[PDB]
Amino acid sequence: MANSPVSVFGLGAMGTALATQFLRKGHKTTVWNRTPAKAQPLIAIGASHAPTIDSAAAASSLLIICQLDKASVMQTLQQAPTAWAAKTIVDLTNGTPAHARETADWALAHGARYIHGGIMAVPFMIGQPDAMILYSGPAEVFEGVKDTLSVLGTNTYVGEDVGLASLHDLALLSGMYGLFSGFTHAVALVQSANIPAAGFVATQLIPWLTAMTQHLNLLATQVDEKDYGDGGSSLDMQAKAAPNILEASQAQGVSVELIQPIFKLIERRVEEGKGSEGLAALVGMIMK
Amino acid sequence: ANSPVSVFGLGAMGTALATQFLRKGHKTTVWNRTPAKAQPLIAIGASHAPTIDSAAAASSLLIICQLDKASVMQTLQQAPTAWAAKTIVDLTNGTPAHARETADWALAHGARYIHGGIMAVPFMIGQPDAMILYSGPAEVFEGVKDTLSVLGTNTYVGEDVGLASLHDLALLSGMYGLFSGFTHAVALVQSANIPAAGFVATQLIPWLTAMTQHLNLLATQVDEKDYGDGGSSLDMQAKAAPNILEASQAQGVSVELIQPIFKLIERRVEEGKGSEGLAALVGMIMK
Ligand SMILES: NC(=O)C1=CN([C@@H]2O[C@H](COP(=O)(O)OP(=O)(O)OC[C@H]3O[C@@H](n4cnc5c(N)ncnc54)[C@H](OP(=O)(O)O)[C@@H]3O)[C@@H](O)[C@H]2O)C=CC1
Ligand SMILES: NC(=O)C1=CN([C@@H]2O[C@H](COP(=O)(O)OP(=O)(O)OC[C@H]3O[C@@H](n4cnc5c(N)ncnc54)[C@H](OP(=O)(O)O)[C@@H]3O)[C@@H](O)[C@H]2O)C=CC1
């Protein structure tokens, strides 16, 4: 292995995928896992198995941590508190913005540099260009390791505050859960009349959602300008579709629990006298 | 010089329908409760019917594009003998029940009846990306589908006259989920003073585009009643949820729009089915 050394801490599904990709691109790859047996498949394709946290940290300057949660990351760090000096830690362990900031503070106090990353991909997609990985933390630190990290996917630096990658990650997941709420309600409705989901989804729902997804750029601009529009696809107009959806759902025996919240928000805005505004107005309503 | 059509209702959508029929050479008779709305159509060749009865008499294909089912019934009931041996194509939005009720009246008055759901705004009428759902007797639809094809892409969804409306409302339900997601995502980034436009254009839209394609695999699982074991399990989703909730709380963002799916996921995990995937949620809201 002729390329710059990397150590990977955590050899679950994701850490295994990261280590595999580093090895495939010729990096000297040292691996560590709390349960040491998980290293064996990687040893078989050229990984070096570190017997301790301390020796994994010593083997490389770039130390990737991909464990379960922030508590587990802290447990790893605290096991060898002098091992991190002059190292760059890239923490790809999911958590809150606060978790990233707290971990960074510890790392900085122990002589390490620290970047947080959020992997927007499943393990199988690591190493593909479609795998987006968000990163945040000091720009100069990121600059030093971004070429090595680019083996994993498309690097997307989102700023200096170390908690920002996690915020972007969780924002994207929130978007996905809305999409899945819509899928669930739509498919329940057609399934309630014995319509197969696959044909409906492939030929009607996906094309419709694709068209409506493009509308989001205009909404985003309105959010930024704090100018929610007048007439058109107003909230007054949306509030006219809602009773049909609710009544049809009730008649088909489909619960409205997943869609009722946005309908209640729309109705609140109408009742405040702002029915002429559009959907961009809803963002400020859920903010503090 | 082409086959006659009558359009009842000259709002934004009815005007667009009449305009497209005229552009494709159909003799187009128009009627509206407020007669002034006919004047622009007269100027491009429409015949203005003085009564509902005379609009019905002018054509075999009678398109009704009004506000709601009550308004459709008001039009029909004004001239109860006018509809015999005519094909009514009702493009007025409502519930499946509304379409069935209207069809029952039409059939009792000697008419044939198709319901359609326009998944498009008026200016898109006549374009291939305008999908129009239709339901009702297949043999009736056969007789009018070539004329109707000038309006958009015909999508026949079956015999039960309420099915076009069910498909339409299902699609809208999907959209409202998408908008719930947009709202929460953008609130979160805005709470940290991140501009929405850059985030949406370069991160959220590409991500949602990729997740939208994943819906085909979920749909297959729903149909097979086989919700998977491991992978992107509900157990895995239930680990992201507390991070989203805690970060939202810290940023002062209400979780009212996403809490319901999190509660459904948690219920399924607690029933011992955490190894199943998101396709399991469809059956949970059915009953
Ligand atoms: N899988 C996925 O699709 C995605 C995962 N992620 C994130 O990547 C990270 C890793 O996920 P994934 O690999 O799939 O999860 P796995 O459950 O497969 O692996 C979790 C890893 O964390 C380790 N770990 C748990 N507790 C501790 C501890 N106290 N001290 C040290 N190590 C510990 C495990 O060690 P041991 O083997 O000894 O149990 C294992 O290496 C998580 O933050 C996850 O949210 C990000 C995007 C997608
Ligand atoms: N426009 C859109 O973006 C979309 C509309 N649709 C559906 O198409 C239909 C028409 O929409 P659109 O034209 O845009 O709406 P408008 O408000 O522009 O038009 C409503 C029409 O209904 C008529 N109407 C209202 N009440 C009655 C009544 N009691 N008797 C007779 N006619 C009546 C109005 O007549 P008058 O001029 O006298 O007021 C007008 O012609 C609705 O079902 C709508 O949901 C479907 C897809 C999207």
Residue numbers in the entry:
A (entry chain B): 1 to 288
B (entry chain A): 2 to 288
What does the primary publication say about this deposited structure?
The NADPH-dependent imine reductase from Ajellomyces dermatitidis (AdRedAm) catalyzes the reductive amination of certain ketones with amine donors supplied in an equimolar ratio. The two AdRedAm monomers associate to form a dimer in which reciprocal domain sharing results in the formation of a large active-site cleft between the N-terminal domain of one monomer and the C-terminal domain of its partner.
Variations were also readily observed amongst the four dimers present in the structure from data set 2, which was obtained from crystals that grew in space group C21 and featured nine molecules in the asymmetric unit. In this structure, once again, the vast majority of backbone atoms could be modelled in subunits A–I from, in some cases, the leucine and phenylalanine residues in the purification tag at positions −5 and −4 through to Lys288. In the case of data set 2, all monomers featured electron density in the omit maps that could be modelled as the cofactor NADP+.
